[PDB]
Write a protein that binds this ligand. Structure first.
Ligand SMILES: O=c1ccn([C@@H]2O[C@H](COP(=O)(O)O)[C@@H](O)[C@H]2O)c(=O)[nH]1
Ligand SMILES: O=c1ccn([C@@H]2O[C@H](COP(=O)(O)O)[C@@H](O)[C@H]2O)c(=O)[nH]1
Lengths: 208, 208
């Protein structure tokens, strides 16, 4: 269930960390920091070095034409999934979905998410239900909201929850609430021993 | 003042276009397509080749920590301004502003913008007024909305309007409505003669 969020700038550093924790993860999530620091080709290299699927957390939020230009390049680089915002509207979301599997942001994990996003959660779930993306982003920092979303989201849609570890969210609470994937970044990549850190979360989720 | 939206993947091609239309533009806007295609260093290259200010249209929309990590690399690469979304919250906006000048999205130009963004325009204007970014994004496709925003937006904040040309917006109307800058991409870079296309729009806005 663990999704490693590799938010370091250095590509070889990312590959080293990924290889050391590969045994305990399900997927790797890359964001702009690593792409900016190593080039988009880092996606293909991570997949070849680890054998796991790659999620490109781009938080796409532009007009349809630009979302298309971006997504085609990133899916072309090997991304298995692309995360897109829902607030920019249906047309921008579809421009990306036409190119590959997507994950729609429903509710974010940080404090600022309560200002405009959280108040529209119901509406976003409605859009996700009609579009039917591979999954949606729910707040690992607010497990009660993960349940809220799960209860209203079509069964076939998965829930991925970031905000575990550094942001304060507990892996066990998120899984119990209905998260299918547990996104973990700093708690693993900033740990003195990333493998030991990943194993601890892996054990927590197994309930041992 | 024309801002060139250089949304092509190829760096040498982008530099050629920029140099050919320099006489008629005031700034160059780089988005993810060019950054992905040529690397973030393309920003430094464009500035060295044209001597014009560069806007990094990243539409940042992540949590505070990640927004900082991204802005660090982009401002570090020479970006004079970074575009960030307001929807994600004030904390995410300030994480970027603490590192350099920003432009906040208030209302977008595509059809999808009417679903969630447009209904919250009043609130977004309020946030922009409190943060005081260099400028905000207003819809070149909806001139009447540009004037609406300008009247309620703090005097010192500039308005940049994309959606001119390809999307149907008219440059004269946007400027007349209160846009300080009009962003133009395809109408220029998709043109057989980029310089001629830029000059035509330049003459269109002369004498507002
Ligand atoms: O609502 C969201 C959406 C995305 N992310 C991303 O998930 C990862 C969380 O990393 P960390 O807080 O475990 O270090 C980062 O890439 C962050 O940008 C969040 O944290 N919260
Ligand atoms: O509300 C917005 C915000 C940003 N952009 C950006 O402005 C440029 C418009 O290019 P074009 O329609 O002139 O080709 C592109 O980079 C697009 O991503 C918009 O078009 N509308």
């Amino acid at each position: 269930m663990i999704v490693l969020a590799l938010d370091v700038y250095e590509g070889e550093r990312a590959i080293k960390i990924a290889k050391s924790v590969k045994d305990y993860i399900s997927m790797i999530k890359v964001n702009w920091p690593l792409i900016l620091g190593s080039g988009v080709d880092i996606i293909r290299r991570l997949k070849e070095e680890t054998g796991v699927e790659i999620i490109a957390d781009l938080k796409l939020a532009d007009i349809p034409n630009t979302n298309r230009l971006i997504a085609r390049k990133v899916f072309g680089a090997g991304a298995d999934y692309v995360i897109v915002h829902t607030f920019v509207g249906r047309d921008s979301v579809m421009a990306v979905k036409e190119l590959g599997e997507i994950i729609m942001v429903v509710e974010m994990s940080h404090p600022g998410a309560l200002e405009f996003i959280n108040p529209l959660t119901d509406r976003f779930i409605e859009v996700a239900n009609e579009i039917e993306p591979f999954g949606v982003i729910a707040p690992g920092t607010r497990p009660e909201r993960i349940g809220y979303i799960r209860d209203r989201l079509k069964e076939g849609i998965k829930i991925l929850a970031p905000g575990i570890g550094a942001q304060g969210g507990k892996a066990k609470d998120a899984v119990k609430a209905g998260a299918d994937y547990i996104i973990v970044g700093r708690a693993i990549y900033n740990a003195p021993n990333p493998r030991e850190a990943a194993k601890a979360i892996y054990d927590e989720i197994r309930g041992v």
